[PDB]
């Protein structure tokens, strides 16, 4: 979500060359790894549709009995996109220009992760882990996005 296009190109180049014996034989890690490339030069409003698509894909694959891992690099670029939409949208900004509903949005996103029994039969159980990289402005962990995520996430 709002990252380099040479970091999504390296994943498309190395994951096929990297293999996993979790299936019993070396199979490209790319065979089980999908991508949601939305670089920074790409529209800011699609940094929000990049995080929804990823968690929905993980939830879909958890609904097949799989233990998926959504790696969201970065969650602070989706929050900046909501800060850029809100600012152009007129409503009152919060502490650092972010909308007052940033925390609710982050909480709703992270509440989609978890271990669950899948709807329907055969009875299967899956899980969705979320690993969200936050990019605090200047490295300061007192940022609104970082504080909200630390409030929500269980591992820091």
């Amino acid at each position: 979500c709002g990252e380099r296009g040479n970091e999504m190109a390296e994943v498309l180049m190395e994951f096929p060359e990297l293999y996993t014996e979790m299936s019993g034989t070396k199979e490209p890690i790319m065979k089980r790894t999908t991508l949601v490339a939305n670089t920074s030069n790409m529209p800011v409003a699609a940094r929000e549709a990049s995080i929804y698509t990823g968690i929905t894909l993980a939830e879909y694959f958890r609904d097949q009995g799989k233990n998926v891992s959504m790696i969201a690099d970065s969650s602070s670029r989706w929050a900046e996109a909501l800060r850029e939409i809100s600012g152009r949208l007129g409503e009152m900004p919060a502490d650092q220009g972010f909308p007052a509903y940033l925390g609710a949005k982050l909480a709703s996103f992270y509440e989609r992760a978890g271990k669950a029994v899948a709807l329907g039969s055969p009875d299967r159980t899956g899980s969705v882990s979320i690993v969200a990289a936050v990019s605090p402005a200047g490295g300061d962990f007192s940022d609104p996005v970082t504080t909200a995520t630390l409030g929500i996430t269980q591992v820091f």
Binding site: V117, L119, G120, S121, D123
Partner: protein, 520 residues
């Protein structure tokens, strides 16, 4: 049990390493074995230290310790007091005879005790005249009387026998067989009380349940044999009232399979009572459990009140707000169907059935009960209480869910029951004799090679006794075809004997062949 059981391990190797040269039986079981120029003749006696002899003899008591005599105890005609002979003489219409044999057993045991003789001297036939076993009909039996101190089998003789059978060990009978003999004494005591009310398919059912109670460890519900004995009885009310004391919970209305045979007019009352109980279970009040019984009766109002008074339950607020609607409205019908299919995906099968019954979509309530909940017993109950006694949804349910498995398992009790609930009586009676795969183009259901066959197809003598009953009451369906019916009656009589003979009840096989009435 295995059809064959080893009784000795003649271990000649314990003396020499040379292999057995030749083996030959001889007069009286003498088993001559040769090796080199050196014989190892073993007499027909037994060494009780052998594991095989010790296991085969078991707890029995035998007059002689022989391979010949042992092979005449594990096999051959039963002593007329053996429980497996008395229950088979009760299933055959010979209850009076069983009472007389029990009386004679008591008299012989008293004779032995009075003379201080050993019980092993007890006569196997109890001094019975064999012609008695051949009497065609129960009411034609010449029930003679004995001297005054114990003239005829009754409560006093029953108690005396139950005491004696604990104070003595009957010969040839494993202790478990003696326990079942005591339960047979109790069952005959019960039948004598009810003998004046229930027809004789009631007596067979009563003995079936009394034997079931003694085998709850290995038997989880009365066999379909007993369900079919009761289903064709004219006094289902008496049978139900006799087993009522045990039907407290649904799990016990499912052991006696009451949904199959009890009259609809009693099944309604039994659902009401079972709903009462299932609600006030040990744990706490929960209208979730008793919902199906109250909807099947068409008592949604009682269920609504039950939800209301269940203030503590977390689901109470949703269910009271939902159930109160009128489900004739198309919108609410669709809402209830949607909720039913959501509960089927949240793995709440019983609640899905409940909701599918709110809207009167019985065909979907019964399919969720028999396929996802695994209660054909409850599915039949709901079908019979909701719509009516026989069909139409019950017919489709049985033909779809039970008929295939019945054909594959080659079960004729279930097949007869199914073609009875489909009110196809003419072929329901025939399904007792001919295997299900050969009925009503059932070969179209499963290929004949998928069905069970080989030694697994062990006959069931009772299966014939029921036919001879139905055949005689439903003659209207058999007057039209006699030669074809005889062609299979004369096969199943000779295949029902040859198990009555292989299970030691030879005296009953001769009675079956002697008394069978061909419908000319």
């Amino acid at each position: 049990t295995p059809s064959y059981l080893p009784i000795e391990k003649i271990d000649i190797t314990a003396h020499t390493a040379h292999n057995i040269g030749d083996s030959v039986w001889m007069k009286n079981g003498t088993f001559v074995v040769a090796s080199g120029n050196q014989f190892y003749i073993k007499d027909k006696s037994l060494d009780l230290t052998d594991p095989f002899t010790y296991q085969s003899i078991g707890s029995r008591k035998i007059l002689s310790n022989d391979i010949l005599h042992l092979s005449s105890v594990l096999n051959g005609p039963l002593p007329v007091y053996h429980p497996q002979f008395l229950i088979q003489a009760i299933y055959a219409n010979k209850l009076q005879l069983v009472k007389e044999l029990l009386l004679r057993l008591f008299l012989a045991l008293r004779k032995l005790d009075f003379e201080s003789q050993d019980v092993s001297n007890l006569d196997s036939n109890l001094g019975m005249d064999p012609l008695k076993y051949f009497i065609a009909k129960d009411r034609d039996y010449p029930v003679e009387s004995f001297p005054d101190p114990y003239p005829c089998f009754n409560k006093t003789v029953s108690l005396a026998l139950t005491e004696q059978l604990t104070k003595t060990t009957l010969p040839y009978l494993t202790r478990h067989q003696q326990i079942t003999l005591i339960t047979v004494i109790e069952a005959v005591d019960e039948v004598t009380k009810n003998e004046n009310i229930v027809d004789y398919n009631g007596v067979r059912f009563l003995l079936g349940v009394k034997l079931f109670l003694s085998h709850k460890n290995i038997q989880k519900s009365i066999l379909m044999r007993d369900v079919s004995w009761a289903l064709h009885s004219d006094n289902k009310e008496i049978l139900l009232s006799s087993i009522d004391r045990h039907i407290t919970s649904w799990n016990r209305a499912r052991e006696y399979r009451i949904a199959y045979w009890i009259k609809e007019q009693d099944l309604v009352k039994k659902f009401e009572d079972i709903a009462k109980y299932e609600f006030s279970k040990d744990d706490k009040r929960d209208p979730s459990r008793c919902a199906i019984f109250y909807l099947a009766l068409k008592k949604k109002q009682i269920l609504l009140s039950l939800w209301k008074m269940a203030i503590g339950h977390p689901e109470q607020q949703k269910m009271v707000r939902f159930i109160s609607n009128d489900f004739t409205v198309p919108r609410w019908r669709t809402a209830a169907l949607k909720n039913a299919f959501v509960l089927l995906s949240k793995h709440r099968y019983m609640d899905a059935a409940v909701f599918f019954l709110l809207t009167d979509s019985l065909k979907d309530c019964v399919n969720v009960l028999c396929k996802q909940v695994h209660d054909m017993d409850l599915a039949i109950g709901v079908c019979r209480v909701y719509e009516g006694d026989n069909g139409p949804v019950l017919g489709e349910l049985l033909t779809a869910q039970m008929l295939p498995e019945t054909i594959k398992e080659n079960d004729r009790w279930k097949a007869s029951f199914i073609y009875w609930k489909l009110r196809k009586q003419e072929v329901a009676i025939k399904a007792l004799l001919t295997a299900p795969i050969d009925l009503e183009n059932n070969s179209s259901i499963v290929d004949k090679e998928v069905c069970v066959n080989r030694s697994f197809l062990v006959e069931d003598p009772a299966l014939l006794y029921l036919y001879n009953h139905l055949r005689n009451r439903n003659l209207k369906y058999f007057i039209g075809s006699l030669n074809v019916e005889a062609k299979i009656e004369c096969t199943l009589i000779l295949r029902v004997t040859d198990i009555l003979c292989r299970m030691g009840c030879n005296y009953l096989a001769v009675s079956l062949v002697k008394n069978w009435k061909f419908i000319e």
